[PDB]
Design a protein around this ligand. Structure first.
Ligand code: HEM
Length: 289
């Protein structure tokens, strides 16, 4: 099973920067969402969930097909709450109807990271919408109530190693959990991309509590929370080494995150040798907009 990237006809860097700008301007304008967190974090989560269905064994799932637009995937209980991100992007899809669904969902993630003062993330175009029968079945996204061994094994399906896993998990500095979506609550209200996830893991006094959905989570008096899968990063000696590395080197964390997130968004896609190089988009701030 081969998914070959095909550039939207006649489109170049300037077309995709226009789409980035549209997303970025709406992120700035629709700022009230989720108690003034804004849509940044949910767009990062959406980019990850549409990519995180991939299976390296048979090349099914992944971002290429834009299959989240179909009912089976849209209604996956693992995707509860992502409808808010889809609704955000819908007017963008209408203004730029030539962009494929997988390109738009993945670009929404890149735009959100960058606009939240995260690292630059190189991005490639050419995902092509595939039909409804290519939609992966539910149950390919990870459970939160598990341990390190589970996390490690899970991410092997996505061809991610320990360092890639720990770097990706730093996105849990962003946004929050919502009881009605996942059965976890809390986490604060952060919408600036930093390495604080690692600092918080190492420095907070964590307590194992049960929430109103009868699930266990780790809570601190500062108002932060860790999922069991988050906390497992300090229980496993290989993960703990990497947590310490990112807690002590913001730049290293940004660079490793950028590479792992690009890889996540590109898994399953074959880029022809003559494809355009990856694009690095300017932020609104860089453009003076
Ligand atoms: C073992 C892997 C993972 C598990 C079990 C996991 C689980 C969760 C759960 C339960 C929530 C709360 C959803 C809600 O209640 O709204 C969440 C939020 C989030 N996750 Fe993950 N996650 C994992 C990996 C990742 C990765 C790899 C990324 C991105 C690189 C990511 C980015 C986010 C973001 C940005 C939010 C906040 C969304 C919002 O504020 O609406 N997560 N995660």
């Amino acid at each position: 099973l081969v998914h070959v990237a095909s550039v939207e006809k006649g489109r170049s860097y300037e077309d995709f920067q226009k789409v980035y700008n549209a997303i970025a301007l709406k992120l700035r304008e629709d700022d009230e969402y989720d108690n003034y967190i804004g849509y940044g974090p949910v767009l990062v989560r959406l980019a990850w969930h549409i990519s995180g269905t991939w299976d390296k064994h048979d090349n099914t799932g992944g971002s290429y097909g834009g299959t989240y637009r179909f009912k089976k995937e849209f209604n996956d209980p693992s995707n509860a709450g992502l409808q808010n991100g889809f609704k955000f992007l819908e007017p963008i899809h209408k203004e730029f109807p030539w962009i494929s669904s997988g390109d738009l969902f993945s670009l929404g993630g890149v735009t959100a990271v960058q606009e939240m003062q995260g690292p630059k993330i190189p991005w490639r175009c050419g995902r092509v919408d595939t039909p409804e029968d290519t939609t992966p079945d539910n149950g390919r996204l990870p459970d939160a109530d598990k341990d390190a061994g589970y996390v490690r094994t899970f991410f092997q399906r996505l061809n991610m190693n320990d360092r890639e896993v720990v770097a990706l998990m730093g996105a849990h500095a962003l946004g929050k959990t919502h009881l009605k979506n996942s059965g976890y609550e809390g986490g604060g209200a952060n919408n600036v991309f930093t390495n604080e996830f690692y600092l918080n893991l190492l420095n907070e006094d964590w307590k194992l509590e049960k929430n109103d959905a009868n699930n266990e989570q780790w809570d601190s008096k500062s108002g932060y929370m860790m999922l069991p899968t988050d906390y497992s990063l300090i229980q496993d000696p290989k993960y703990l080494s990497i947590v310490k590395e990112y807690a002590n080197d913001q730049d290293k964390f940004f660079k490793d995150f950028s590479k792992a997130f690009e890889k996540l968004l590109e898994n399953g896609i074959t880029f022809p040798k003559d494809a355009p190089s990856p694009f690095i988009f300017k932020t609104l701030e860089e453009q003076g907009l």
